[model samples]
Target: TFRNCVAVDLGASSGRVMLARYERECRSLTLREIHRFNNGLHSQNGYVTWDVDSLESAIRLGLNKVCAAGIAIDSIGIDTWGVDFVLLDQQGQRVGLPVAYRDSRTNGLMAQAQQQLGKRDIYQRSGIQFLPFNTLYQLRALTEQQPELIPHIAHALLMPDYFSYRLTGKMNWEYTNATTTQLVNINSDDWDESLLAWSGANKAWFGRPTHPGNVIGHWICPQGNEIPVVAVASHDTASAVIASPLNGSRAAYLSSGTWSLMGFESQTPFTNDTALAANITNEGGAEGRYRVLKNIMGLWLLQRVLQERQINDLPALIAATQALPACRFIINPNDDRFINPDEMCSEIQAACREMAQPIPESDAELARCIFDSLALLYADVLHELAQLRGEDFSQLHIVGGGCQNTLLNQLCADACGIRVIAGPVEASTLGNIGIQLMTLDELNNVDDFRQVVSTTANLTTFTPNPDSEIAHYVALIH
Candidate 1:
């Protein structure tokens, strides 16, 4: 009997393979990274798209290593950045390259939608934020761009689901990722027919989404060992949240990555006017739970700036940035303008100009600006969330790669005036494999797996300073 399971964690900038092993006697689960690969949007000709075939090859390369090591894989799950999907033809061939979520086609779609259908109605029905690149808007763009292929389109699968299909020849729309589309009704457990109809999507294109632990099918390896493909939390943020050892309503999660999703798990979806006005989302989670969160444009701002500067040593960069005074300029991290900007260095300056703040010219100042913006936004969002939930957050749980930024973690502690817990940076992988285990009855459920994570993970704690007032920064962004 196989005891090892695999988790394919895909991020905006990279992907990694994680092997999870459960010691049945000790009731402990262990996770280890087996392989890692670089991944990002590739622009060819006129379209910016994902090299999904290359990604599939990369996945194969990792799984091959598992087989080579003579490990009998029990199960596997895949999770990735949300909102991007692939359309398949009648023959099951992908119609075209999957467009990256950051592609510019959705620039005015949300605003257009607001005018066509009242914003409140849309939010009431879906409980999703009004983002330009949400799958609802992206699908609208694709339908307009590829009118000839609508009839030929047989299925639509988000990136993670698509990859799983490639491995098992089984099709499923996982709940967590489907909620990211802004097309699925969080309360209904299915895509909203009205929203789909308006967004140029057919309800038939997607079946009811499967919860995180459902076993989709099996993959027979070259070694003739059969590996079951389990449906994990297909949204990376949801997966990270699953690994978060949060206890009550007063503790929230910051699934820090390319995007920082700050919110708490809710038993009931928050779709009222207050939550809608707060611009928070209710994404699907395991066991009929909802993750109500506010999305902050996270490390992507810093990542793009560093790419422009051709720098990679983030610790050194942050240290250099710390030598400069605390941020004197603020750019709203959630601004649509920052998404897929042509040049990030200049973009920061441009934002400063628009805000009537002095532009940061040096690398340190620019980096500091991004850190301040993110931390401040994180604070504001949490405060707003607290107001809506009618409870003050006592602690902030920061997980995923972005939590590795020691400076930002401290800044977030100060900015929020709350205790911060950071660790188990590969949280998505842990949760992905945890779901696989629970699906196969190797583990009990999310809570049981979380107890295992708390026991196994190396966690860090930071106390906040009450002096880090965010009222002023709140005014600045407004």
Candidate 2:
């Protein structure tokens, strides 16, 4: 028998609906893109927010297209970038426009929160890294910036759960995405009441978080069938990790994209002082594992440079960049200024200038700076993760679109001193579909599903080419 599923995988930049078919006998899976749409932060009423209504329309358009095809879908799941949420009123209407996490309203709130509530107390409670735009700070910004809206909020839902609620008319919190808010208790695996209180948010606004595999409700397709809406790992990273072909405890995975989440899977949370100092997060993952990871500013730098330069020849640019000396010019990619800059290339040049380094003059030079900086940053984070885990990683699995850049993969392997395996570019969608297969009893668990993926998916391996210059640069930079 064959089971078909739909995965609505949404990133910060784009969203797509995929139709995947899994064959029981051959244990094969194939994914077809049904619809695709561009997604970006919207500026409305003096705030950065999502065009949620447009997103809803795009999702419905994708679903109806599948229903029109007359295919019997087994289940449907939704996964999106984490840490943004929507507030609902008593009538289940959005209280106001859901603010995008990159908005400047959260500028000083993270440090203020650290001061108000001690840093250790907050990190120990939630095991989430303290990012400036965490939902905790976002909520604080809301209460301080828009006090009147608080009176109307009856419930709060993370992005994926909000979309699921819109489809199934049921309200439930999915665990993976809930952990990204920096409000979920590491001990209880539920919203931390004290943290919620600190943010001036009501605990009653959230429900007990649920894991993947449980059917939230059903969506009645146009084909006259009610397709089960299973709650997959709703966070995009969680879903991507589910599809990552991690071989053993010694293996690490990087869900590389706009944000490169580098970490390994563990059944335990790392809340110790060392882990806390490194700002590593223990996000919930499929089957009760903690996604112990650190977030690195990833390809956003290159993406912006390309956009600003209006350069379309990526391959030619990478080739030119490869000819330049590695690490001759570099900037700290994780600098806060790179988060949302008025002009990314200029911001990068200014950063280099402050460091008394030569400014990147052209597209190739700028691209080289980004690639070198990101590779070095990846190595730094990987070392931190390895130290936190108390063991050496056998290999690093690079999963997502960022891995498609063969040049960056080799740089990462060389800097990290490990073999790099990259593939399964459609990781979030694959994981979203894999969970549905498990929910339908077509697969036993994540490991079994991973085995199937390992056999069928095309993968590339990069061997490290040790260079004394690379090592010297890493030592000098770090």
Candidate 3:
């Protein structure tokens, strides 16, 4: 296995290039962030879209910084949020802007699909949750909205695939990311023809989805340093799951960020009705494991509330919420209405009013509402996961940037009635490194890797009880 590698972990709001060096004797992995830059949606001509070129520029700029740091990288890998894709023409030119997942174009399309094709049929076929922004729905939106663009499109590459192609000119759809599209057949391991036909997208463009770790091609740097680009867990959640320090199959992981993905590693997908009703998704993970999980709206609520209300000092706000007597309002964090509202603060207030609950009048009240709602959702999912696993889990491993929030960690433990272990804020980066090292057979199995990670990781534990609290919020859902 290569001792040194670079991980380009791209997030919805930011991107970073991290260098990871593994020592065999120490069995330790050291990470250094070489560069970081802001990433966000840009609106232009009445469409919300991702600035793909800008992201690539930032990625290339970061790679240069890595090489300039005098660290010769063995290879480069990339992982990003899933489902959104960029279409390319026959000449490999992006046909149009890469539409952001939060764009309004997909509004109501998921419901339409549900009625036209049976919801059970789609879920059983794909084993993916019904998100309006999934690639299947996005492609359908484009096909119906702009039919003329279809003839020129020759390839559709996911974000990481697009970036990797831009870097090395090799096109490959990674497995973990493909599962996010709700297009891959869980049993067959191929993109479903029915989905392609349904979306009216070209089947040939998808080609074959490959598991992570194969060398795609070589990246020729301006400094004449040639580094091979390898396929890691192209989906950021997959990378995060890989980076989670779990002792065995009994442990659950929360890849917390803008989205909180809670689940455990499973050898098979959970496509049953109970799982479907719970809205659990079987996102693909590294080493052929399935991340049997549910996606919950997470810190994005607090993020939007702060941005729209001219608020700052998030730590102080969190502390204020803790000082409050109790949460006066609780809104379902996964409600589609919360997905992309113009002003989150006002929408949340409106939601409480409509639900006959006390509206949050102040910033602290609003912050508490989000935290309590999220924790309640966590509890529900935890119960569902235990039901699916046929046993109770003692440990919940919280990984990613959101793990830095101690309040949420304690709330999660309290609501879910499980021990919470939080750390390794750079989960996607570390998972990126793990996949790279695994490809070389240097790191043995996930079990051993987590054993090493547990010994080295800086972890904080929280324990609490919230039996009545869990019930109060769970009843509101029905």
Best by lDDT: 2
**Candidate 1: where is the Cα deviation over 4 Å?**
310-312, 350-359, 467-478
Collision count for each candidate, in order: 0, 0, 0
Rank all candidate structures by their TM-score, best first, as comma-separated numbers: 2, 3, 1
Worst 10 residues of 2 by lDDT: 468-477
Model 2: residues with Cα > 4 Å off, grouped in runs: 467-478
- The estimated TM-scores of all candidates read 0.92, 0.96, 0.93
Task: Report clash pairs, candidate 2.
Answer: none
Give per-residue lDDT, candidate 1, residue 37.
Answer: 91
Superposed by TM-score, candidate 1 places the C-alpha of residue 48 at a distance from the truth, in angstroms, of: 2.0
lDDT by residue (tens digit), candidate 2, 1-478: 8999999999888999999999999989999999999999989978999988889889989998999888888899999999999999989999989899978999999999889989999999999998889999999888998899999999999999888888999887999999999999999998999899989998889989888889999888775688889899999999999999888899999998977889999988998899988879999999999999988899989999999999999999999998888887789998889988989999999999999998898899999999989988898889888888888888999999998999899999888888999978999999999999999999999999899888868989998776645666766656
The global Cα lDDT (0 to 1) of model 3 is 0.86
